[PDB]
Amino acid sequence: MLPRLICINDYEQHAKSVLPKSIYDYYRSGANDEETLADNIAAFSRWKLYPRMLRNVAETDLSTSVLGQRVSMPICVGATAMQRMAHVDGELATVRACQSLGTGMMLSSWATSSIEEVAEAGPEALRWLQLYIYKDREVTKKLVRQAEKMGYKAIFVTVDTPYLGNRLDDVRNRFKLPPQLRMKNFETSTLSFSPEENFGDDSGLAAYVAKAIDPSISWEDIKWLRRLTSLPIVAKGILRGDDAREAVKHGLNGILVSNHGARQLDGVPATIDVLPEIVEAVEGKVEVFLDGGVRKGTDVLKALALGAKAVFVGRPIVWGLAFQGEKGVQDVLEILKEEFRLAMALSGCQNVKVIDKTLVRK
Amino acid sequence: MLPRLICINDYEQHAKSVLPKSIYDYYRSGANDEETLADNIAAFSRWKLYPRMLRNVAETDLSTSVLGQRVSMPICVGATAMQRMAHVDGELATVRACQSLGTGMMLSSWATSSIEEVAEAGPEALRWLQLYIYKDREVTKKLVRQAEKMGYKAIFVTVDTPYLGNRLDDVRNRFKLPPQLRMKNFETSTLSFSPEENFGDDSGLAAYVAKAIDPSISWEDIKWLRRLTSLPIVAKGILRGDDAREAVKHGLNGILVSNHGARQLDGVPATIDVLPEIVEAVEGKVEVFLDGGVRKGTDVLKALALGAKAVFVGRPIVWGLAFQGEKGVQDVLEILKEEFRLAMALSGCQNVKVIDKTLVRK
Amino acid sequence: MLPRLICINDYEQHAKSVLPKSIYDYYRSGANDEETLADNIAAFSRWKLYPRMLRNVAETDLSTSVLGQRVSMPICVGATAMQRMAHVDGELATVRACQSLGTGMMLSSWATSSIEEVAEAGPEALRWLQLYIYKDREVTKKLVRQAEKMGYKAIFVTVDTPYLGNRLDDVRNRFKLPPQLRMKNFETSTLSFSPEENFGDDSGLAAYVAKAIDPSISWEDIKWLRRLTSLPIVAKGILRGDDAREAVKHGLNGILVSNHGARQLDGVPATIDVLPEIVEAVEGKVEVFLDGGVRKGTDVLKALALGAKAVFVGRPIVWGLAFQGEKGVQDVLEILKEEFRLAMALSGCQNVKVIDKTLVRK
Amino acid sequence: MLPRLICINDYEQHAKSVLPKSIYDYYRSGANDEETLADNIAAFSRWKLYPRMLRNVAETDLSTSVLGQRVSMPICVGATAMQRMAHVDGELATVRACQSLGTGMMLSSWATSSIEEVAEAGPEALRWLQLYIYKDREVTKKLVRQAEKMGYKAIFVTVDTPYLGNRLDDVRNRFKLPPQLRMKNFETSTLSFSPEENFGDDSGLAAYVAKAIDPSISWEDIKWLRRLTSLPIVAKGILRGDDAREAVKHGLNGILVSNHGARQLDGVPATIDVLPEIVEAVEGKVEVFLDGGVRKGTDVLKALALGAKAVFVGRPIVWGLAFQGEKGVQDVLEILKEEFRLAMALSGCQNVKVIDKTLVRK
Ligand SMILES: Cc1cc2nc3c(=O)[nH]c(=O)nc-3n(C[C@H](O)[C@H](O)[C@H](O)COP(=O)(O)O)c2cc1C
Ligand SMILES: Cc1cc2nc3c(=O)[nH]c(=O)nc-3n(C[C@H](O)[C@H](O)[C@H](O)COP(=O)(O)O)c2cc1C
Ligand SMILES: Cc1cc2nc3c(=O)[nH]c(=O)nc-3n(C[C@H](O)[C@H](O)[C@H](O)COP(=O)(O)O)c2cc1C
Ligand SMILES: Cc1cc2nc3c(=O)[nH]c(=O)nc-3n(C[C@H](O)[C@H](O)[C@H](O)COP(=O)(O)O)c2cc1C
């Protein structure tokens, strides 16, 4: 009769009921037959928890740090493009909620709000820029320079998207932005993903990527980026230990173990399953983060037990927006925070420093 | 047309048909997505039986002992709170059925009948008290002293509930006691869980626990309890071998391998799967019991084969109450007894002493 | 519109459509939650075939022998009680079909036709008696002596039924014989399972067994039987290697690896899964047979690859009867024969002697 | 409203909607309970991809070679009988599409178009003949000689069909050719599979095979074929390493790891699962190919990672025909090509030579 939403799945169900089909499908979809999409969630269930009893959990402290900046909890907002499709306030709502929670927001290069607009809305929020390497390196450099100028604290360079994955619903729906919206970090019709522009007869976004994003990028482009900015840089989308070691060798400052929300290559493993290999490979030299399939407090606990410093959430944030903008994002983050606090307490962990590998077994 | 209930699942189906939704949901629920709830049952199915033929099973003897007290069968009633929601006679019905069967009843601290009332109803019944450590240690001590005075033979201290688990239906339903009922071991409105008292806008019971139950408890509180009473004490809710060894070191007299009916931390293993680790860890120094998912005679057989002295049943007892009070509990216990007798006979076991590890393989 | 039944599953579907519910349920059921019933079939699917190509399979020879008697195929009829419930001609139809096919029939002690009647109907058929050890050993001896006199060639002594398993539908349905039928090997109202006799308020057959069948039997009773008859004796219902070795030590002549069609102890392994252990344990000293879940030619092939001499089929035969008596049983046996011939041919096997362990992998 | 078919599964769904039931069922079916049919697809999903990032995939080159002949992609058309049932133009449509794509077509001996007709329609297409060994070796020789004369570049001799598998729908439907069609490589009523000819009361095709195809063939017949033609010969239908080694010893030039689209012996492994054993067994001495269950670009990638030179597709081609003849086949091949290109790019592979075993893990 009146929404009573008490877990992240409830927010998704609500979002499906209120969003236009093409928009819900864009946000929900994975690549191809969505094998990895299912596995990102199923894999968490296979990792079992071995809680310690009688540890004194009256005072739980969820605080930690990400690349040297304190956060209230090891749960941060990951980059999700074009948030104004979910709610009129989009990324401005999201950053305000992050400011309230004391956690960080990773801003998409494909945001429907500019780097500057987001900084103005959340001046005291911890903010990072997710970067795509455009064919036009002057565009790419401008994004980085604006992030520096506007008080962003890291670059998350996405390394798994030389081309866009094939999301079948987006092809069926001929996905494009609603008429009033643009990718607001760009000036030209092409780069702003104008829905009045020719992006072919399939997914508009796949065509956008083919036109705008450089499929040639290599470790040499990582060298270029490392020279361009002194900001911390995290490689986002690494799934192999050898690639993780290469990122460390290139002077990067973190790895975000990610399969892009299962939206790129289908049939890759779940992120929680590859996380241990990556943690082992980097030998403590950089922080390792995870995204993909985080929906519950126990997911966060499992990721930290396997050596992630923090996790990022994608889709849950857009479901929060779809419910009630800033307040909805606040709600989703508070649910995750409280579920994580309870999971910590019930497993005997007073703080994030005592979350150890003995807590989990596959 | 007329109930013909011949197995425990039939009693649950009947209970669902007659109980108010909020009450059925409270009794049925597990925590969060109920992964462990499903696994407590599924795990029993993965343990396969290797029966011996031609052993002479004309005389089966199901009798055993629990902490030195003889019982008619290795199947005992576990603590389930607030039984008068299922049937007007609640815990008084349950204890009378246990008296008839010759098995033991573990009484919840959160019973809708007092320690004294239950003793008066079942004077010759084997009875134990399940204890929660209240913030108020005077309350806690009074519970123990009353159990001693009223002829209870052990304390089962619950160690997995510093806070209540998150049972989604109880949040949705805003679970609370029916207006005529109270937790009858307590005098004050707060501690008696009065449904006229302010227990917030979510699960009333979760708020009750946050107000009443001490999240700080540690092994030091176990030391306090061990000094307080000379009764046998069993640690209820242990899932790790290291914790089991610590319980032995603290002078406790048993371990009840339990995930709290899958109602606390979701994603812990099934109790039948962790039982072998715990049996190995305690090296025969104390009795080890199991609860969680026992529905059939073969479940009992599997638990004993893996080294449990006895098992406890939770939900089946409340379904018995929902059917027909004392008679219904009697029925459920008799079904379990007869199923266990048949399973013993068909596997070549004349008595519980010959139920060996070679009977099972995972 | 008109039955077109081309595989064993089709015969079952037809049987369900024409038989009274209580009769279909009696024949179909397994014990308790029917975990083993499902597994008897599922386990065959997990054993994969590794066919050899280009072996010359123009001439396939399915013939073999069972306990020294030639059969046309390694597929024989297992004991299924009370066949006249499925078709007026019951066991007489079955034995005539076996005579036509050139395979053997194992006659139930609980047949609705006498040992003599079956011999008269199928004088040239290979016939064996399945024996239950009655409390009354004079009854038991009479069965054996009649089998000897009437040209039966072996005794299959059932060793897994000290009591009947708990088949839930039979309890719900209060299973008993139709009014015109009896267990025709017995004279008295009790032993003939008269439906006019008091067999309690649950399954009539469970009560019959409790009254008639001896739960005390042991290896000493096997010694008695071995002394009583010089006929070959097969132990039916062995699931453990140690028991198989004991059967060999007692001078028995075969083992039928059987979980009684999953009708006795639920949660035992599938017969195809325990067959290798039993074959290994007996070291070629006696023939090993399998029943349980055989529905297709590839099931037969898998069993022989893992070292069974022959398989027995239970339920498929009664579905044949339900369709069209003798002709229906003939049809089912011919389908199994042809499926087995094709499976042999496609796997490169010209005869049963070349069916080797390399053909299968789990 | 109007077909929008964007993946191979969409083409199948369309085909089911437009084809007569008997024709769709013939094309779709596997043998018996279709366990292998399901597994051919499911097995691909169990092999997980481990993509390399930042490799420079701006220029992807899909080209390779098959038995010394260049192809545009490692995706070729496998033999599927009687294609004119799907579309009036049948095999002529298929060969024209292959010519356009720059890939090869394997022509069925049971084609509804002659060897010569197909050569005339696709003179510049890479074409191979799939050969069945007929009882009549003069027929068999004529097929080979015509393939030689008409510019076919290899013989794929099918070695897994001494008899036809039992496809239940074909039995139910009494499958036969539509009245206007014939197997056009043959002159006589029997060998042309005339639907006016007596092929029994079950599957017409099973009876055709029993009459026409030689179940006696052995390695001696492979010796005969190797002497008959200097064309490259591939053994099609090998599932064992020992058989693969024998094919190499007989001077054959390739192995097509195939379970005949799961249409012959049911319960054999998926082809992707046996491929590694076969690749290892032949020690690089001949090319190894795969068919069975290829539906997506990632399937192609997985097969090449495990050492296949190329894959063949069966059913997808007939669904293309059912949609729109030549254009439909073109569409299906272009979808597979583009999916494969994207999978290569997202996994860091610029060309087929760098697709390595480290890309996959089961
Ligand atoms: C709707 C949507 C949009 C996304 N947009 C971007 C993006 O612009 N840049 C990027 O690097 N990753 C993007 N991602 C990937 C996310 O940063 C993140 O890896 C993913 O959402 C994590 O999985 P989850 O949705 O299961 O939490 C997107 C994911 C989704 C679901
Ligand atoms: C409705 C319900 C109420 C319970 N109340 C208590 C309680 O008051 N104290 C306690 O220590 N455990 C309690 N438990 C946990 C049980 O003692 C026991 O661990 C659990 O019921 C065993 O699993 P089963 O229900 O599958 O048999 C409760 C469980 C249920 C289902
Ligand atoms: C309806 C039915 C009746 C049976 N009756 C007997 C019996 O009288 N004696 C016996 O030893 N086994 C009996 N069995 C067990 C069978 O001999 C055999 O072990 C079983 O049917 C094999 O499994 P299947 O039905 O999957 O082929 C019976 C099984 C069924 C299904
Ligand atoms: C409808 C159909 C007809 C076929 N006809 C032949 C044939 O005539 N000769 C042959 O060697 N294989 C034949 N096959 C097997 C295919 O060559 C190939 O092994 C199989 O289709 C591959 O699996 P897929 O359909 O999953 O791609 C046929 C398969 C199908 C589905």
* Alpha-carbon Rg of chain A, integer: 19 Å
Biggest interface, chains and residues, is: A-B, 27 and 35 residues
CATH class of chain A: Alpha Beta
Largest sheet of chain A: 8 strands, parallel
Order of helices and strands of chain A: HHHEEEEHEHEHEHHHEHEHEHEHE
CATH architecture of chain A: Alpha-Beta Barrel
Q: Could you please say which CATH topology of chain A applies here?
A: TIM Barrel
Spatial strand order of the main sheet of chain A: 4-11-10-9-8-7-6-5
Name the CATH superfamily assignment of chain A.
Answer: Aldolase class I
- Percent in helix of chain A: 40-55%
How large is the share of residues in beta strands of chain A? 5-15%
| Number of DSSP-assigned strands of chain A | 12
By secondary-structure content and strand pairing, the structural class of chain A works out as alpha/beta
Bound molecules: flavin mononucleotide
Number of separate structural domains of chain A: 1
Please state the overall shape of chain A, judged from the principal axes of the Cα atoms: globular
Quaternary structure type: homotetramer
What does this entry look like structurally?
Four copies of one chain form a homotetramer. Chain A is an alpha/beta fold and 362 residues long. Chain A has one domain (1-362): TIM Barrel. Helices cover 42% and strands 12% of the residues of chain A. Chain A is built from 13 helices and twelve strands. Chain A has helices spanning 8-18, 21-28, 35-46, 90-101, 115-121, 137-149, 168-173, 204-212, 219-228, 241-249, 271-282, 297-305, 315-347, and strands at residues 48-49, 64-66, 69-71, 75-77, 104-107, 126-131, 155-158, 233-238, 254-257, 287-291, 311-313, 360-361. In chain A, the strands form three sheets. In chain A, strands 4-11-10-9-8-7-6-5 form an eight-stranded parallel sheet. Chain A has a two-stranded antiparallel sheet with strand order 1-12. In chain A, helix 1 (8-18) runs antiparallel to helix 13 (315-347), helix 4 (90-101) packs parallel to helix 13 (315-347) and helix 10 crosses helix 11 (271-282). The radius of gyration of chain A is 19 Å and the shape is globular. The A-B interface holds A 4, 6-7, 44-45, 47-58, 296, 298, 302, 339, 342-343, 345-347, 361 and B 32-33, 35, 159-160, 162-163, 165-166, 168, 171-172, 202, 214-219, 221-222, 235, 237-240, 242-243, 246, 264-269. Chains A, B, C, D: Its EC number is 1.1.3.15, 1.2.3.5. Chains A, B, C, D: It catalyses: a (2S)-2-hydroxycarboxylate + O2 = a 2-oxocarboxylate + H2O2; glycolate + O2 = glyoxylate + H2O2; glyoxylate + O2 + H2O = oxalate + H2O2 + H(+); 2-hydroxyhexadecanoate + O2 = 2-oxohexadecanoate + H2O2.
